[PDB]
Design a binder for this molecule. Structure first.
Ligand code: CHL
Ligand code: CLA
Ligand code: CLA
Ligand code: CLA
Ligand code: CLA
Ligand code: CLA
Ligand code: CLA
Ligand code: CLA
Ligand SMILES: CCCCCCCCCCCCCCCC(=O)OC[C@H](COP(=O)(O)OC[C@@H](O)CO)OC(=O)CCCCCCCCCCCCCCC
Ligand SMILES: CC(/C=C/C=C(C)/C=C/[C@@]12O[C@]1(C)C[C@@H](O)CC2(C)C)=C\C=C\C=C(C)\C=C\C=C(C)\C=C\[C@@]12O[C@]1(C)C[C@@H](O)CC2(C)C
Lengths: 196, 152, 193, 41
């Protein structure tokens, strides 16, 4: 579709049949079709996780302007005491995520092989694409048209860049992502990466 | 105290070495007028020596009985900056260089006279290939999985 | 299948009892090697399905855990005990001699067999109640035996490993410790100190 | 000149330029951060 850089030609292997195809591959990673098949799923999962991560790192700090709750910052949330030890929670998380991610992985190898429930055999996911399971994962039956997929990919890429910015700013400034915005909005020409 | 060693900051022999070096540097300065350039150079040398000794004291090195720092390479987390991190950086750089060389060699293998492209380098193609080695681990690992790394 | 969506090895057709295609390393490729492995698996399962009752029952009667029963033999002059009653012949060189002779005879007797089927399910006199009379029931029984044996082997591995993390403790003691405070007395602390 | 550009791509001249730039970079790096025995970061 669109060109990431006018005046340059698109790669041959990027034919525009994929969602969010702007012909961006200067370093040629996806020349091998198997690499492309793996990297599509990698991008999807990374974007979907980063969107939730950013949403959870930003909004629980926006409370200061509205003053509903009192929650520690995203980099101090770990040290707080909880009803269970950190090791127990980590063990349970590992136990569940092992099964979940092994179930997801088998679809990439042999599509359509894990669409059936293992305990209640009368239940099965409708046939779909590799990275878009559907079924009970889509309770509202929204149509997965190409426009919605492109919107999803754009939001995922933006959120990934936002998470990288959130990580890098804290190492330098030492404050929260929202506090960095208000300081910039106070004196825009004096509060940038160039401190002076 | 690994292997019976002692921290540099508590070592008396380390301080004695510093004092001897500084005293040796100071005896040469008495031969020159304070305003002269050699006096300025000797002052800079003395300041640099003091700074080097202070920095070695700060980083948590270990000294022996001779007052000289020793390196621990067994993998202990308290000394990862001595061997592990520079090793990983060197491995990354060497893999970059090797991958770029292999890519350039493969690129010109299909030409009519591949030998002439080795004594007279094709600058634009190499420049285009130079940037690609920045992600060499991913490309090498995926090539290994696909079986294209080893010649048949 | 041990993992749905995974191809099976060609030599694991799904007709053997307790066959689910589990062979990631391909150790059963050689037909002569795979035939031996079934006998060894059955022997291991049958030996481990007797140990599990023999580890929990003495501990459930307050006679001490399964590693305390072996402490006395390291001492000079230690004498064996059974149900709290010392046995007259419980000296170390009397026990070692009678164990080697009794076992070396039966295992060598099993070794000399040359019919592959009788090395796994010998039948005959060792089946006094005649449960093998029905070939239809027999297949279900073999599946049940194989499914229980692997569980017993896993239980014995748990027995062995739990001892290392909690020296001097019995499995029932570990269960009692876990039951009181489940959310802090578990595996997590051992893995992450 | 095409021939002049060809002579600049020969192996010895290119190697000399590359190694000169490399040595300059290393000298400046060791000038800014002298006496590095450990990676402290
Ligand atoms: C992704 C991810 C990143 C980048 C971090 C990064 C951090 N965690 Mg963390 N964590 C992450 C996932 C998780 N953490 C934790 C549990 C904890 C705890 C208990 C602690 C951290 C702490 C920290 C900080 C260590 C300095 C740092 C901000 C430490 C901290 O917050 O100190 C300021 C800390 O005590 N994390 C869990 C649950 C198992 C995670 C999933
Ligand atoms: C993804 C993701 C992850 C990993 C987390 C993880 C966490 N959130 Mg959280 N959150 C997310 C998305 C996510 N959130 C989103 C999308 C919203 C909206 C929130 C709104 C939210 C609130 C309002 C609070 C948390 C809190 C917490 C922490 C303790 C609660 C818990 O998990 O038990 C924990 C670190 C709690 C916290 O930090 O204090 C305990 C808390 O009060 N989250
Ligand atoms: C704003 C970003 C965004 C967008 C546009 C979409 C869009 C889509 N997702 Mg989706 N998704 C997202 C974020 C997003 N997702 C995230 C963060 C996760 C991780 C939890 C997922 C997990 C997910 C799964 C597991 C599945 C989808 C599926 C779909 C498709 C059908 C459902 C639908 O239309 O929902 C529309 C959603 C919105 C309009 C968002 C409204 C705002 C909310 C707060 C559609 C193309 C399904 C699919 O493709 O199969 C049919 C499917 O099975 N998504
Ligand atoms: C959507 C992405 C996004 C957005 C909106 C912002 C926004 C902001 N960043 Mg920022 N940042 C980002 C990504 C982003 N960043 C990334 C990816 C990095 C890592 C390289 C950084 C590293 C960074 C530092 C180190 C600092 C900021 C700072 C700031 C604030 C002042 C503006 C400034 O100096 O720009 C700086 C712009 C850059 C460093 C270039 C980032 C690349 C652009 C933004 C990509 C998006 C187009 C402002 C709120 C400053 C701050 O805290 O203000 C008080 C500050 O000191 N950012
Ligand atoms: C020492 C005990 C022992 C032995 C000899 C065997 C032997 C065998 N098992 Mg097995 N198994 C065991 C313990 C054992 N198992 C345990 C504890 C479990 C539970 C996790 C299983 C679960 C299991 C499954 C799910 C399957 C087998 C199968 C098999 C057969 C083919 C695989 C092979 O070549 O393994 C021989 C390998 C070794 C002897 C290596 C030993 C370890 C080394 C370090 C073979 C007869 C497969 C089969 O065809 O069933 C009939 C099959 O599908 N096993
Ligand atoms: C076949 C494997 C096996 C082996 C090697 C042992 C070995 C042992 N058992 Mg034993 N046991 C077994 C199976 C086995 N048991 C089974 C299947 C049961 C359930 C009926 C028991 C029930 C049992 C009790 C109730 C006691 C022992 C005890 C003992 C120890 C000394 C006396 C004894 O029974 O000698 C082995 C001779 C015949 C089994 C000895 C270490 C005693 C003990 O605690 O020792 C201190 C004891 O009190 N066992
Ligand atoms: C006497 C004056 C003088 C001064 C003040 C400098 C200062 C500098 N030179 Mg330099 N240089 C000089 C004379 C001088 N040079 C002469 C006479 C030669 C021989 C012709 C060189 C050849 C030279 C090379 C080959 C290189 C430098 C580089 C550098 C920079 C090193 C810092 C760096 O890498 O950060 C990054 C750079 C900057 C922040 C600004 C540039 C620094 C700004 C290095 C450089 O620029 O690194 C990129 C570098 O590679 N110089
Ligand atoms: C494989 C052999 C080897 C290795 C691992 C090193 C490693 C090192 N040398 Mg080195 N060196 C070597 C051979 C080697 N050298 C040889 C053969 C010579 C003679 C030409 C030198 C001459 C030399 C000088 C002159 C200096 C180093 C320095 C250093 C340190 C570099 C500090 C930095 O940031 O860069 C580092 C520990 C620098 C340093 O300060 O070390 C503490 C430094 O000034 N080296
Ligand atoms: C996960 C990624 C792979 C990990 C394992 C890599 C090694 C290859 C697989 C070994 C798995 C394996 O058991 O391979 C067994 C294989 C073949 O052994 P043999 O030919 O003697 O026996 C074959 C029979 O076991 C077939 O039923 O290799 C060997 O000769 C032994 C190598 C280990 C020797 C250890 C002792 C050394 C002294
Ligand atoms: C998933 C993700 C982050 C997820 C974060 C999560 C969940 C965070 C959770 C937490 O916060 C909460 C919620 C609770 C907080 O208290 C605590 C934690 C737990 C911390 C990031 C991905 C992040 C991914 C990123 C940044 C990727 C960047 C990649 C780029 C730029 C690639 C560029 C190229 O790829 C192309 C386009 C083509 C190549 O040819 C050319 C190049 C140039 C090479």
């Amino acid at each position: 579709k669109g060109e990431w850089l006018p005046g340059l030609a698109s790669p041959d292997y990027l034919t525009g049949s994929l969602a969010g195809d702007n012909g961006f591959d200067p370093l040629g990673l996806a020349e091998d079709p198997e690499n492309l098949k793996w990297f599509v799923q990698a991008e999807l999962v990374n974007g979907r996780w980063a969107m939730l991560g950013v949403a959870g790192m930003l909004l629980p700090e926006v409370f200061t302007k509205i003053g509903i709750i009192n929650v520690p910052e995203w980099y101090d949330a770990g040290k707080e005491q909880y009803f269970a030890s950190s090791s127990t929670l980590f063990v349970i998380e590992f136990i569940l995520f092992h099964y979940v991610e092994i179930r997801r992985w088998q679809d990439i190898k042999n599509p359509g092989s894990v669409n059936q429930d293992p305990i209640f055999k009368q239940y099965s996911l409708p046939k779909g694409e590799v990275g878009y399971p559907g079924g009970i994962f889509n309770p509202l039956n929204f149509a997965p048209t190409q426009e919605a997929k492109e919107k999803e990919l754009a939001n995922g890429r933006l959120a990934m860049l936002a998470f990288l910015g959130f990580v890098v700013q804290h190492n330098v400034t030492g404050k929260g992502p929202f506090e960095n915005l208000l300081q910039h909005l106070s004196d825009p020409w004096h509060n940038t990466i160039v401190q002076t | 105290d690994i292997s019976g060693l002692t921290p540099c900051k508590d070592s008396k022999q380390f301080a004695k070495r510093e004092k001897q070096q500084i005293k040796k540097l100071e005896s040469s300065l008495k031969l020159y007028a304070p305003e002269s350039a050699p006096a300025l150079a000797l002052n800079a040398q003395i300041e640099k020596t003091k700074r080097r000794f202070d920095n070695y004291g700060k980083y948590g090195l270990l000294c022996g009985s001779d007052g000289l720092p020793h390196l621990i390479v067994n993998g202990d987390q308290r000394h990862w900056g001595e061997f592990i991190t520079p090793g990983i950086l060197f491995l990354y750089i060497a893999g970059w260089i090797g991958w770029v060389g292999r890519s350039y060699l493969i690129a010109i293998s299909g030409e009519k006279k591949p030998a002439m492209k080795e004594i007279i380098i094709d600058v634009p193609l190499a420049s285009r290939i130079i940037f690609r080695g920045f992600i060499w681990p991913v490309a090498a690992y995926r090539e290994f999985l696909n079986g294209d790394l080893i010649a048949k | 299948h041990w993992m749905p969506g995974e191809p099976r090895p060609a030599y694991l057709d799904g007709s053997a009892p307790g066959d689910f295609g589990f062979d990631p390393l391909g150790l059963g490729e050689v037909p002569a090697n795979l035939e031996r492995y079934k006998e060894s698996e059955l022997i291991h399962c049958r030996w481990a399905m007797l140990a599990v009752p023999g580890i929990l029952v003495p501990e459930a009667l307050g006679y001490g855990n399964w590693v305390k029963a072996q402490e006395w033999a390291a001492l000079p002059g230690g004498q064996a005990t059974y149900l709290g009653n010392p046995v007259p012949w419980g000296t170390l060189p009397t026990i070692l001699a009678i164990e080697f002779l009794a076992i070396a005879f039966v295992e060598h007797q099993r070794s000399m067999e040359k019919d592959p089927e009788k090395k796994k399910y010998p039948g005959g006199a060792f089946d006094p109640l005649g449960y093998s009379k029905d070939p239809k029931k027999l297949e279900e029984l073999k599946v049940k035996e194989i499914k229980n044996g692997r569980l017993a082997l896993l239980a014995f591995v748990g027995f062995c490993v739990q001892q290392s993390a909690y020296p001097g403790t019995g499995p029932l003691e570990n269960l009692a410790t876990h039951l009181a405070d489940p959310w802090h007395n578990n595996i997590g602390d051992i893995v992450i100190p | 000149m095409r021939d002049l550009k060809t002579y600049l791509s020969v192996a010895p001249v290119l190697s000399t330029l590359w190694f000169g730039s490399l040595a300059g970079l290393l000298i400046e790096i060791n000038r800014l951060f002298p006496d590095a025995l450990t990676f402290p970061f």
